[PDB]
Every structure is written in structure tokens, then in C-alpha cells.
Amino acid sequence: PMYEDRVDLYGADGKLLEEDVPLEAVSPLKNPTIANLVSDVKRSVAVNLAGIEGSLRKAALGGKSNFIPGREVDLPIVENAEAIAEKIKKLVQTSEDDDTNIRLINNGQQILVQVPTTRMGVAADYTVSALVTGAAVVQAIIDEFDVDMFDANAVKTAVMGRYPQTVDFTGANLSTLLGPPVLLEGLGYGLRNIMANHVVAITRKNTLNASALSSILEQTAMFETGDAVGAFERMHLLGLAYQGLNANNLLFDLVKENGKGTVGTVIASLVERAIEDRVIKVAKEMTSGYKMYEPADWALWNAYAATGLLAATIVNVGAARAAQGVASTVLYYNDILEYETGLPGVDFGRAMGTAVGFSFFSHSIYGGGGPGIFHGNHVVTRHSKGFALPCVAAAMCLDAGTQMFSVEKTSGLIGSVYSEIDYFREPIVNVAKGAAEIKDQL
Amino acid sequence: PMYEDRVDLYGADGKLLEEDVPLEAVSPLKNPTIANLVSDVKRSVAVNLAGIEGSLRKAALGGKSNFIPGREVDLPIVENAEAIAEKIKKLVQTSEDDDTNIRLINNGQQILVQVPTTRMGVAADYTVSALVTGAAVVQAIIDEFDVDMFDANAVKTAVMGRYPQTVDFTGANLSTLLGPPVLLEGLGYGLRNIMANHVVAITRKNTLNASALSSILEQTAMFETGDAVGAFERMHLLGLAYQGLNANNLLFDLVKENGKGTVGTVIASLVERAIEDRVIKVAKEMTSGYKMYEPADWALWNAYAATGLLAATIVNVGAARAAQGVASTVLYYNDILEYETGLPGVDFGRAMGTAVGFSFFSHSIYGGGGPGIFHGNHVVTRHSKGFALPCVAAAMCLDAGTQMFSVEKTSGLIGSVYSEIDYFREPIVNVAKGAAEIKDQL
Amino acid sequence: KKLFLKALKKKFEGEDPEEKSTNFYCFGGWEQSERKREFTEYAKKAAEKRGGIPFYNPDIGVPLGQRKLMAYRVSGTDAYVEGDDLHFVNNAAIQQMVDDIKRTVIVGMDTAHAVLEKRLGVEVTPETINEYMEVINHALPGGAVVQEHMVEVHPGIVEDCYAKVFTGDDNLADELDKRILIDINKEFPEEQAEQLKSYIGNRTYQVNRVPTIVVRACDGGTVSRWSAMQIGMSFISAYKLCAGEAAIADFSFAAKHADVIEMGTIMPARRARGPNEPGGVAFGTFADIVQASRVSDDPANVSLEVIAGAAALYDQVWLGSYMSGGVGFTQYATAAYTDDILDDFLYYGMEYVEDKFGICGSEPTMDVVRDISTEVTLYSLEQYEEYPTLLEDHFGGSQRAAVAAAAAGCSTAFATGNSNAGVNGWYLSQILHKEAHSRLGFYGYDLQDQCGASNSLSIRSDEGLIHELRGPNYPNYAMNVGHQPEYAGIAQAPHAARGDAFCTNPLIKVAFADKDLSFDFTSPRKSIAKGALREFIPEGERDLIIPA
Amino acid sequence: SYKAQYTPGETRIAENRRKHMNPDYELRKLREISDEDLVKVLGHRNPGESYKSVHPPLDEMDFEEDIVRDLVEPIQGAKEGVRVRYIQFADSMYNAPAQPYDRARTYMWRYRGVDTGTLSGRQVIEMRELDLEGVSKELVETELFDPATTGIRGATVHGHSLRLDENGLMFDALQRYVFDEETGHVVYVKEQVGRPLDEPVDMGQPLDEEELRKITTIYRKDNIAMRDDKEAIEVVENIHTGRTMGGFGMDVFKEDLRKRLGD
Numbered sequence A, B: 001p002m003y004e005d006r007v008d009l010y011g012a013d014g015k016l017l018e019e020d021v022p023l024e025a026v027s028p029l030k031n032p033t034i035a036n037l038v039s040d041v042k043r044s045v046a047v048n049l050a051g052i053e054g055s056l057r058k059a060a061l062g063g064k065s066n067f068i069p070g071r072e073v074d075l076p077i078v079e080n081a082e083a084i085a086e087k088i089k090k091l092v093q094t095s096e097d098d099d100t101n102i103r104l105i106n107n108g109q110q111i112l113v114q115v116p117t118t119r120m121g122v123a124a125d126y127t128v129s130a131l132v133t134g135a136a137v138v139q140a141i142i143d144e145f146d147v148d149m150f151d152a153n154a155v156k157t158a159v160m161g162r163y164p165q166t167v168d169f170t171g172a173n174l175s176t177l178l179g180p181p182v183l184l185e186g187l188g189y190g191l192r193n194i195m196a197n198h199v200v201a202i203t204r205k206n207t208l209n210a211s212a213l214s215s216i217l218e219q220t221a222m223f224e225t226g227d228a229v230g231a232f233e234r235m236h237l238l239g240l241a242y243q244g245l246n247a248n249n250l251l252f253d254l255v256k257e258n259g260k261g262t263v264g265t266v267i268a269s270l271v272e273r274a275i276e277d278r279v280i281k282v283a284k285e286m287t288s289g290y291k292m293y294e295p296a297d298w299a300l301w302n303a304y305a306a307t308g309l310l311a312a313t314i315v316n317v318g319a320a321r322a323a324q325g326v327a328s329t330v331l332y333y334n335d336i337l338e339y340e341t342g343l344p345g346v347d348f349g350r351a352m353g354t355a356v357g358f359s360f361f362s363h364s365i366y367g368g369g370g371p372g373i374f375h376g377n378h379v380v381t382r383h384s385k386g387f388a389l390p391c392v393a394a395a396m397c398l399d400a401g402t403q404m405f406s407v408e409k410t411s412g413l414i415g416s417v418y419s420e421i422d423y424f425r426e427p428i429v430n431v432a433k434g435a436a437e438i439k440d441q442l
Numbered sequence C: 001k002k003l004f005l006k007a008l009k010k011k012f013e014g015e016d017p018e019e020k021s022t023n024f025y026c027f028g029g030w031e032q033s034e035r036k037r038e039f040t041e042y043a044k045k046a047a048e049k050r051g052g053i054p055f056y057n058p059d060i061g062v063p064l065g066q067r068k069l070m071a072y073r074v075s076g077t078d079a080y081v082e083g084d085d086l087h088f089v090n091n092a093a094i095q096q097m098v099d100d101i102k103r104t105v106i107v108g109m110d111t112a113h114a115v116l117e118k119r120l121g122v123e124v125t126p127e128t129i130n131e132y133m134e135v136i137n138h139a140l141p142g143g144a145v146v147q148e149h150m151v152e153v154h155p156g157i158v159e160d161c162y163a164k165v166f167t168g169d170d171n172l173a174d175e176l177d178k179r180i181l182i183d184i185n186k187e188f189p190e191e192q193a194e195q196l197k198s199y200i201g202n203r204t205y206q207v208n209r210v211p212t213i214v215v216r217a218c219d220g221g222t223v224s225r226w227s228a229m230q231i232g233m234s235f236i237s238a239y240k241l242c243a244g245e246a247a248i249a250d251f252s253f254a255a256k257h258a259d260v261i262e263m264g265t266i267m268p269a270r271r272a273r274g275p276n277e278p279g280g281v282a283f284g285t286f287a288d289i290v291q292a293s294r295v296s297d298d299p300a301n302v303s304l305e306v307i308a309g310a311a312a313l314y315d316q317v318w319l320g321s322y323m324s325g326g327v328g329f330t331q332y333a334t335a336a337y338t339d340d341i342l343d344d345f346l347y348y349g350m351e352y353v354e355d356k357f358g359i360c361g362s363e364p365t366m367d368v369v370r371d372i373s374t375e376v377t378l379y380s381l382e383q384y385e386e387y388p389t390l391l392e393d394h395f396g397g398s399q400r401a402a403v404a405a406a407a408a409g410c411s412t413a414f415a416t417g418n419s420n421a422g423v424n425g426w427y428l429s430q431i432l433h434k435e436a437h438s439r440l441g442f443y444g445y446d447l448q449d450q451c452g453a454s455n456s457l458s459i460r461s462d463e464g465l466i467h468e469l470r471g472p473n474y475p476n477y478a479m480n481v482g483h484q485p486e487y488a489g490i491a492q493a494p495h496a497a498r499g500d501a502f503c504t505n506p507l508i509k510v511a512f513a514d515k516d517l518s519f520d521f522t523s524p525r526k527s528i529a530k531g532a533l534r535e536f537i538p539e540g541e542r543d544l545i546i547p548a
Numbered sequence D: 001s002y003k004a005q006y007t008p009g010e011t012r013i014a015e016n017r018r019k020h021m022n023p024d025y026e027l028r029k030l031r032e033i034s035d036e037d038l039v040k041v042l043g044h045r046n047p048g049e050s051y052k053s054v055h056p057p058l059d060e061m062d063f064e065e066d067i068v069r070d071l072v073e074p075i076q077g078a079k080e081g082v083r084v085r086y087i088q089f090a091d092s093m094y095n096a097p098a099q100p101y102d103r104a105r106t107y108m109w110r111y112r113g114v115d116t117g118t119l120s121g122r123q124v125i126e127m128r129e130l131d132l133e134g135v136s137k138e139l140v141e142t143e144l145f146d147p148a149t150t151g152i153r154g155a156t157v158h159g160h161s162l163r164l165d166e167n168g169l170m171f172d173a174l175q176r177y178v179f180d181e182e183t184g185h186v187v188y189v190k191e192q193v194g195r196p197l198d199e200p201v202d203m204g205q206p207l208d209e210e211e212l213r214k215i216t217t218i219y220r221k222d223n224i225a226m227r228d229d230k231e232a233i234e235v236v237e238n239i240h241t242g243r244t245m246g247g248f249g250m251d252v253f254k255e256d257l258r259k260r261l262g263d
């Protein structure tokens, strides 16, 4: 292969999945599970039929506390969800043999619509899924009940919200994991737009699968932004493999041996492991006896450091079962690590800097919110190139109910709509199976 | 197939290409040529090596008339274009066997970079191609000349402009046919963002290939926005086939028989043809003898009407060999057609309405410009759902040199960079060959 | 009697309103006008300040005033003013109308109160809400509440800054300090009060008006932030919290995102603006901001008051400056609120509807839209044909097209109760007008009218949208004068005919039912008139911090 | 074969519109103007000066075969690369014999290589200047022009909607034409942007009111009301209804939808 690195892939239960795997087998550019996961995130649309119906019944149209008296339309949409879904299927598909998927959820109150890849292939960006799904839902409803021409625009408004007066689907009754590109902070940030509470809901609160899904999306986004190009590619792959996918069981063993420990003891365990594995070495011993270290392999040191970072998050937030401590943990893990060793911390300071602002904007009057609402497209937590947000996913799995903006409050139907998708819910085991499929092709 | 319609596909020379083709054989969802054209538009990036070099030499960084004295970097980039291109290839590709394409143009002063579909597949939107290409160019240059750490950020700024202080690549020395999605007017508008003058340069000023390329991109965008879904799909396919692709030679024959005629005589020829083909019929004869018509087939009437509109543009702008008249032509072709017949004009008024604003914003103080700078993502000319911009592409092919913002001024290198792509330059014949490839699979 | 005749008779004194001929070139040019003379005189007095730079000069370009330069009656008032006094730069009332909208945000209090009780174990009572409202009325205008060595904003320049609370819970309303209460039962007629409360429920909201000087120095995007910062400080102080703990971030997210109601939404990049700017105000949002609905049960009067405010907002300020600038678009807008001309046409249409269908007496059908729009358009055109002075008054085709179609569209909405049937009627009126006079408006006036019939009842992507929620960013509407103000009237019309308390949002409607606003939103006509007369005292001037 | 209809309507006003639009209807000449005087009032060039180009002769612009391009005959001004110039009219709403959309529709039926703009207060044609001068002569000499109610004006065009002056002429803030009281003729003393003419151009006598009521293309209650042309209104409503139905889509495209639904 291109790189010489090989790793063992271990599951979230700390047991070996795949032995002696070339690093590139988990590259977003090669792994077939990652490709399918990204395709599904882009093409999937949640249709809230119960919300469309109730919006229409009250003329509760176009967002928070809007009502248009006199424009109510009373239709039995949920009772006819099966017929409406069959119509949506006919309108969205490109052929009977394609990969269009329509699934009713929650007694027909919601639909998961997965738009065929043929439509994505001839579209410029991923908004096509929402747009095509919205058009099919509007026409399916109008046709199902023969909605008259003067009422039809209310159906349109119930489905897509205030668009096009708003730049997006404000107050709509459909949603996607990715928001429209007009709201992106950075070019190429589409995959970073999923709030941590949604990640937790998709993985049903399982700590390491949440942090894995976050790492997969973040690092795949780093390929999209051009950050994981050339000189930097190996750093991002090693980051994914170690911090996201529990390579060589390092993440799991660090937590296990520090289950009654602190952020400091996790640092000591990680530095010791890095010395044994010859990832770092002593550069100079100072007058006091202090040993200043240097990396022997900079991308691999960063990966070891990032793995200790996630382990420290799990130990310290796991001890509190309160997610607020996550920003502080990310901050002082890096701070202590640097002054313990003389080495650069995770992402060469950017994970620590991200945590400084994240701390401030989760404890102050100025903006932000609780940890669960942050994501890689948020101005506060965009700065680390994939190494910080997996900690927030892990932290919110471990919160036992201390948040006002909890998973239930922000993400209440996200589990029922998306978590039955195996690669979403259980990314580690399925990425490992993908790695096994291609390991001999690299 | 789904639809019963069949057409004969004729070339820009008015001669038969394919007989008895199912309508869906030219669908953006089915035709393999359209899929490949759209893929190439999304993945292609123009790298201006000469511009990067001169920008560095003068510290002319970050947009027009910027200079940063003292920060000049003097490098023989164009002299080493081959070596640099070979490095870009290694950085952009995902494997030696993939569809990465790097072509030096204009003695190495520009590079056409086509990013591999594998990278597009795991990215959320089409900006990946610019971002990855920019990252590869920056590293290739820094590595080729061992640019020192304090000068390196100037190379970055020379390639990508003022990003990220600007939301886009302001003042950059790379470009794409599609701008970044944060500048889209409407959701799904990515494919509509190509100015008419660029279309004219890509097709080397060949009238009907320009109008075809514009129609293909516009109508493919209507699939992306969800407008060509369900009830409306057939209207958009017939529009593409007749107005964009000279179905049944109707476009060509209308121009030919009116080469010494007027917008009015084109209308008379089109209405007569529509009566002959039983596309419209008399609904009521009025006291004065005036016959009010109705469509027998609404989507087909619209397609006939749209074809006459393009023919009228070619006749009336072609008579003047001056593109300014295009907006007036689109306006009054529709206005006269409606009062000649009682029928709705092209796109049920929206082509006419587009033309009113387009006339205004190409003759007033308030905005706009000459016809060559408009496109479907422009606030002025977004309103017709694919039926108006092909006229502007045709018109600028016919301009003999009356514009300040001419092709040469706005699009001076666009031909040398992109026009060698056969599908871009000659879309009609190649779409027909794609249709022949799949006609019996439908 | 025609409602515009009184104005014509004063505007064309000494002349028969029906006479087709007159004399021109006999007025002395610009010297016929008090205002033009004043302007020229100030231009000369400016010479020293400008140090030689040329300036306003009536001898540059067009010699204005070869015809008689008109005065205008502000409709529904007895104020007669020159057109220049209605230019938004010259009229402090118009500027304060916009500033009062830009500087208002509404924030739900129930989430913050849940954070206090559920997360912080702190009890919320009427007494603690009252104490909080007292604190935020010191903090919101720039007073310090926690830190030592704070500098503060001069209270003398922010006396217009304040916060109030309202609630759908009558039991809580009876317990809140009335100095800071917007009392729904006192501001609204009984039936409207009952309707508002059924939609608002047992929810509580604070209405924050940040200082006028702040939105003038900065922008509309400042407002939700400024409100949220001081809401946070006021919870910390009033409830005695640790001044910087995790729960505080919940108040922030609630006040800036989860529980905030802004007046306007953001623009796409080509016309980029933050929230609470005019392009982001939906037509139904503006109709709810205007307060004529709660003091008048005349649906024509209510719609006409909305159109007057919206002409100032959308045509004069938004399109005429934000999107263009210069001399701008005063008379494109004044045609819809002067000389009682639009009044005459709309009262004709309302009376035609009352007689033939009844107000709200028809379901929406194309037959009804065609009947009403055609009849009111013909009546309107005939008025310009019977009165040469009327046609010389509304001298620009755009003016005439907007006013005839406004009467047609509102009347159609009166009959059918459906705003989109109204706007379909507006599009019929425009193409009939065009075919009658063989002209319509300016070069690019009917872009949206030729696309309008098809998009009025469309259900597609960027075409379909219920009319109340369309606004200046609806794509067809994003460029041109002579439509947006009247569309606001069409959004109001079916709701005024029904007697609804609001068009789109009961929180917006209550939030402007407040005598302590500076601009009088119960009658935008009367306030604009007071500005035209130089009798309106705006907010935000800087006299206290600059030399005498 | 096909017989053009031009416009609906049962009244004299509609037939006047149809006559203007019909290329086989010969417009009556009411006056004559010399070539020199027409060029002088246009104001773009002096007579006798060579036509000025904006680009080289057309046969140097055609580098590549374009079969569709060569289907269309270029007008002579295009062949020669002559610059584009304009004429602009205001038409009084007191029954001027031509009116703004009437003009646009007439031009697009009768003339080749037209760029025409319609506004309430003026109507402009921009054309290769060589061909503009031929077209303009017809627009000034025929019943499309009345010197009292049709004003030639490229700037400061106010007046279409104003009362007529005491001599029956339309307002012109720049007074590009004046009434000669000695003769009763309307005389141009300025060209269409307002520069003074060295030599005034006589445009002859105004049409009388009764002739204007007979040949005008505007509807007015005091002459023939729009309300009276039930046929024209019926067709306008039909266009409106058809556009509404097409935008709504679901009924006119019902069979297209049924094929998409697999029904």
C-alpha cells in the first residue's frame, strides 16, 4: 500500500475484530462501509406526516408560533400513510430496480425516505434529496385527497416551511441530518453539521459507537475540505483508526486501566504507552531532571495523544455522569499533557483551543449552549480538524440527565427514524467488516 | 417506458441523428452522456499557474488591486509546470487506476484538474474538487521549490485567495464552473450558476450547441430542485428534448423558414405547426372571428411554444447580430403568442416575466449588466424553470462584437481550458449517442 | 362622492378636475416650491463646511417644475405636504417606524423558567418575574448589574429602551407588575383577546426593545444578541446565580435560538443582511406589526393602514435605499397612501363585494376571483380616464397599476378569505390593466405579474408559498417597486374581513400593542403625516453627547 | 396555411391594434420628413457623415461553420458593423395614435433585428443605426405619429399622463417642440435628447380630436371603454386562467402524473 502502517481493529466491547489491517483499509477513500454511510447520510430524509397533518389542521404554518386563521385544512394523512408512502416511492424512484427506500416509522407518523443514488449522481449537491422528497410528499398528499387549488399551497407550506421567503426550510415538517449548504460556516463542512445529541440518538447512547460515528464523519469531512491531502493524510487516517475506531484496543485499555482514575492518571498511562511503543523519545534532560520529549513519528504521536484525549473524556465525564465537564476535560487533558512532556498536544493545540472556546460558550451569557448542541459546523467547535467532537459524542452518551437541552429535547425522534440503519448505529463493527473486504486489494 | 412519447433527434446541422427515440432516453436521470457531463462539471477545476506565479511575484494577493509589499515570492512555476502537475496528480488521485485527469493547457500556464469520482462520492457537495485541488497545488508548489515556512502562507493565499476571511475563494487563482454553494440564490441551484458567456466559450460560439448545453444544465437543475418531479416531469423532459435538443428538427426548421422573417412570422409558423400536429385546438370562436385555442396536451404545447421562443431569438438576434435584443425578443415572443391564440405562453408566463426583468436589468441603472453575465442562479433570470437561459446562450453566440462584457472579457480562458471536452463542446451529438445506447433498455 | 375629489380640488385649485387641458412652463421652475427654495438655501449655506466641493444645485440637470409641483394629502388625514417631506431621509417618523421594528425581539420565558426550577432548583413566582423585569429595565439600556468597575451607557440617550412581558395565562397576568405588562385583555377587543389567548395558551413572553441609537449605529442583527446578553445578566442578578456556570448557557441558547421570535429572517448572499432587516419581514408579519386591526373593524381601513406602513417600509426604505439608493422611490410608495385614491378604489370594491357576495360570503373559486378583480380594475381605470387631474397625480404607470391591483386583490380577499386568491386577483388585474391602456409600469415592473398567475397557486419548490408568508425575498418579488406594500395589504385583507386578531403570529401582534412605542402603529398614516409636518420627535439622537 | 389573428377584440380599438400589427396592412402616410431632418431630430450623427461602426464587417466575425447562424439573413447595418442607436417616443393617453405595447407588438411583427422596450411613459427601439433610420422614417411619417400627442424624446420624458397644454400639445419639460401660432404646425427646435437644432424641423399639423378617437389604440371610457370589449376581456381572462392552471399543474398534467404514479 501507500503507507506501511497496519493496525488491529477492536470492537466497542474491547474484543478483536480484524487482525493486521493496512491503515488505508479504514480510509474514507477506500472503505466501502464509510462510502455507504456517507451516501446514506446525504440521501436520507425524515418526513413528519403527523407534523404535516397537525400544521395543516391548525394552519400552524411556517415556524414557531405562526398560525394563519381561516386557512386550516383537515386531512387524514397519518391514517393513509401507506398509500401516501407508495406514491412517494413512485415519484422519488428512477426505476423499480434502484436503491430508493421508503420506510414508515412510529405507526405511520414519520417516513424515512432514502432518495436513489441516481438522483444524487446528476445533482450538484445533497439538497436534492430533501427537495425531491418534499415535492413527492406535496403531490402525494394533494393527489391522495384531491386537495383543491386554493388549499394546495398550504400543503406545500406545511411540508417545506417558509421557503423561499426564508433561505432554508424554516418551520418545515421534513428534516435531514445535513442542513443546506447556504448555512455552512466553512467550505466542505456539510458532513460536520450533525449535532452531538443526534449522534448519541442514532447510536442509541452507546459511548464508543457514538464517538466512532462522530470521528468517521469528522475525518471524512477532513478529506472533503482538502485538509487530509498530501502531507497531512496519514495524520487524519491514524486519527480515525486510533481515536475513532479503537485501533490496537488502545482507547479501550486506557479507559479500563483508569476506570477509578483521573485525567492526570490517563495522561500518565498514555505517555508510558507512547514511550514503550517508541512513538516518542527523550530530546533533552533539563537541570531539574525534567525530560523534554520529541515525537519519533509526528502523525502517530498525534494519534496516540488523541486516543488518550477521548479516554480522558470517558473517564472524567464518566465519573461525573454529567456531560458539562467535557469541554474542561478536553482543555486540561491537552494542557497537562504538554507540560508533562514538552510535546505538542492533540491537533497541535487546536483541540485545546477548541475546548477553551467550547468551555466559555457552555458556561457564559454570550452564545453556545449545552454540549449536546455543538458540531463541527458550529463557529465554536469547528477549529480542531476532527479530534474534538468525538469527545462530545462520548460525553453526551454518559450524561445521566443533567441537561436541559438533552437528547430527548433536541433529538427526540432521531433514534426512531435513523438508528435502525446498521452502519449508523454500529459503525465500528461494520467499518471493520468493510476493512476486511478490501484489506487484500490495497 | 413510463411515457409514450417518441422523438427523432436531429443535430445542430439539421440532419437526423437518431430515429424513434423514447423521450426518457434523454432524461437527465437516464442518459449516460448527461450523467458524465454533470460529473465533469462538478469535478473539474481550472488552476491558473501563471496567475499564481505573477500573484506571488508582486505579492498581488487576495483580490483586485491588493498588494502586500515585502511579501513577494519569485518562483519559476510555469517553467516547472509538468513536474508540478505530476505532483498534483499523485495528491488528487485515489488510485493509479481511477478517473483522475490532469491536463496542461496554454504552454503550462493553466491546468485542467478533474478530481476522481471516488472523492466526490464520499463528499457532501461539489466544493471538494476545488478544495482538494487547491490543497494539492499548494503542496506541490511548496515541495517543488522547498518554499520556506515564512513564505509558504503566501503561496496558499495566491492559490485560494482571501479564504477564510471571505466566505469564498475571493481573489483566488483557481476557478470552477460552479461557485460555492454558500452563494446560491435557491436550494439546488448549483448547476444553474454558469454565466451565458462561459457556455458560449465552452461550445466555441456554436449557436445551437450553446443553447443545448444551457438547456441540459438548466433542465437537469430542475430535477435537482424537485421541480421536474411527478406531474411536472414530462413538461421538463419535453422542454429539454424540443428546445434544447432540436427534437423532430422543429427548432432548426422554424429558424430556416424564418431566416428573412420576424418574431411575428416565427409565431405564425409555430402556431400553424401546433395546429397541424394537433397539439392545440380551437376552444371557441369569438364574435370578431377571433379563434381562442386551448392545448390538447399541455406539456407538449409548452414544449412547442418553447421551441418557437428559441427560434425567434435566433431569428431576431441573428438579424441584428447584437445580443442586447434577446430580452426583448423573449418578452414579446411570449406576449404576441398569447394574444395571437389565447394560450398560455412559455412556462405559463414565467419566461415572459423573466424577460421583463432581464430587459430592465440590461438597460437600467439598478443592476444586471449585458446579457452575457446572466445565468439561472442570478436573481434576475432565475424565474423561468429552464426555458429562458438557452435563449441567452444562443444570443451571445450571435453577437458580432457589440458588448463591453463580451465572451473575451468575461470568459477569455474558458474555451482553452474546457472546450476540448467533447460532451461540453458538442452536447447535442453526444447526448444523442447516449440516447441510442440506452433506448432499448427503457 | 369619490373619495379622492377633495384632494384633487385642493391640489388643482382654480382648475376643473375633469378638464383635459392646462397651462405649463409658467411656474418659475423650482422657485414655485417652498421646499425646493429651502433646499437651495441650505445648499448655499453648506458651501463653507464643504470647503469648495460642489453640492445640490437646481441648475444641474433637469429644470424641475415645468409642470406644477404637487402637494399630497396623506390619506385619512388633513395634512397636505410636498412630496419631499415624505422622503424617508427627510421624514423622522418613517425612520422611527423602521427603527422600532428593527429594535424589537420577543423571547419566550417558559424555558428559562424551567432551567431555573429543573436545573437550578430555584423557584419562579410572580414576584420573582416582577423583580427580573425591573432588573432588565436597568440592564437592557446599558446599566451594569454584576461586575465592579463597569462603564455604562448614558441613560439620557437610551430612554426609549425597555422591556415588557405578556402572557396568555390570565391568572399570571393579574399578578404581574402593570408598569411592565402588555395586557392582552386591555389592548384588544374581547373577541380578539379571546382568539389571541387560545393560540398563545399558558405561555409567557418578554418583549425587548433595544435602544434606537444601537440599531442606527449598528444593524438589525445586533438586536437578538443585545436582548439575549442582557436577559442573561438579568437572570444572573435577579435570581442570584453564580455569575458564570453551565446552566447560564441554557438561557443563552433559549434567548438567541430556541425561544426567540425575530421580526425578519436572513437574506441570501447576493443581498446579504442579518435578521431584523426589512427584506426579511414577511408580509403577514408586517400586517401583524401594524395595530389598525385592533382599533378598527373596517376591513378596508385596516388594510389601507397596513399598506401605508408597508409602502414606507418596503418601497421607500427597503427597495429605495437598502437595495438601490439616491433620490429613491418616494412617490412609487406615496401613490398608495395619499390623496384617498387607493381608498376610493378599495371602498368601491368592498361595497361591490358586500352587495354581490357578502364579506366572507364566498368560498375561493376562479369565477369569483375573475368577477371581482375585473370589476374593480375596470372601475379603477375609469377613474383615471374620467379625471385628467387624477391621472396627472398618479403620473407613473407603475403607481396606477399598483393601486388598481391592490384594490382588486384586497377586494377578492374580502369576499373569499383567501390571500392567495387575493394575489391571483392582483395578477389578473395587472394583465387586464396592461391590455386596456397598452402600457403598465416601468421597464421591469411586471416581471412578477407575468409569472404571477402561475406561481400564485403553485405548489412547487420556490414557487408555492401561502401568501401571508411571502415577503421581499420570495424570488419573483425580490427586485421591483409597486408590489410589496400592496401585498402586505392583501395579506391583511382576508383576516380583516374575518375579524381575526392577527394574520400570521399572535406573539407579533401582541408585541406591538404598546403605547410606549415611539411610532404609532395603530395608524401609520397619521404618524407618517406627523413626520411630514416635522412634528414627530424620534429616538436615538445624540444631542446629549455632542457640543451645544 | 395559417391566417394570423394579431389580437382579440370586437371593438374599433382592437381592429386598430390589429392593423398596426399586420405587416400586410399599409400604414397611411400623413406627412413627409426629409432624410436630413430625420437624422437631425434623431441627433446621433450629421447627414453626410459616414456611418460609424462598433465592430468590423460581419464577414470577418465568422471564423467557424455555424449552420444555424447562416440560416438567418443579417440586416444591412449588421453586415456593415454599424453602431446601435435609438429612437424613443412618449404617447399621450389622450388617444395618441400609437401606444407603448401596441408599438412593441407592431415592431416585432413588421421589423427585423429589433431591441424594443415598453414603459408607461416612453417606448424605445434600439437598432443598427443604418436600419434605425429607415424604420424611424415610417414611425414619424405614418398614422403611428401625431406631432401633438407623440413626442420624440430620449430623456426627461414626463408627459404621457399629463393634461394637454393650451394648444393641445403634450407636455415636454425640455420643450423639444413648440406650437407655431402663425401656422398651426408643431415644430421641433431640439433633437430627442434636448440639444438645440440649428434649423427647426416642421412636423406639420396636429390631428383633430375626432381623427384620434378613430385611429387610437388605447381604450378610454370617453371614447371606447375596455368594459365594452367583452371579447377582449374574455381572452385576457382565459390567458390568466390558463397560466394559473399551468402553474398549479395537478389537473392539466393529470395524465402525466398518472404515468409517474404507475397508475
Ligand code: F43
Pocket: A363, A364, A365, A366, C143, C144, C145, C146, C147, C148, C150, C151, C229, C230, C233, C236, C243, C244
Ligand atoms: C457574568 C460574567 C460571565 C459572562 O458571560 N460575562 C460576565 C459579565 C459580562 C458583562 C458584565 C456586565 C454587568 O456587570 O452587568 C459585560 C459588560 C457584557 C454585557 N452583558 O454587557 C461583560 N462581562 Ni465580563 N467583562 C470584563 C472582564 C471580565 C473579567 C473581570 C476580571 C476582574 O478581575 O474584574 C472576568 C473574566 C476573567 O476573570 O478574566 C469577567 C467575567 C464575567 N463577565 C462574569 C462576571 C464576573 C463577576 O461575577 O464579577 N469579565 C475583564 O477582564 C475586563 C473588561 C470587562 C468587560 C467590560 C468592559 O470591557 O468595559 C466586561 C464585559
Ligand SMILES: C[C@@H](OP(=O)(O)O)[C@H](NC(=O)CCCCCCS)C(=O)O
Pocket: A361, A366, A367, A368, A369, A379, A380, C225, C256
Ligand atoms: C457563538 C455564536 O453565538 P451562537 O452560539 O450562534 O448563539 C456567535 N456569537 C459570538 O461569537 C459572540 C461573540 C462576542 C461576545 C463574546 C466576546 S469574548 C453568534 O452570535 O453568531
Ligand SMILES: C[C@@H](OP(=O)(O)O)[C@H](NC(=O)CCCCCCS)C(=O)O
Pocket: B361, B366, B367, B368, B369, B379, B380, C270, C271, C319, C320, C323, C324, C478, C479, C480, C481
Ligand atoms: C439585481 C441585483 O443587482 P445585481 O445584478 O446583483 O447588481 C439586486 N438589485 C436589485 O434587485 C435592485 C432593486 C431595487 C432597484 C430597482 C427597483 S424597481 C442587488 O443589488 O442585489
Ligand SMILES: O=S(=O)(O)CCS
Pocket: B360, B363, B364, B365, C442, C443, C444, D119
Ligand atoms: O426606466 S426604468 O423603467 O428603466 C426605471 C424606472 S424607475
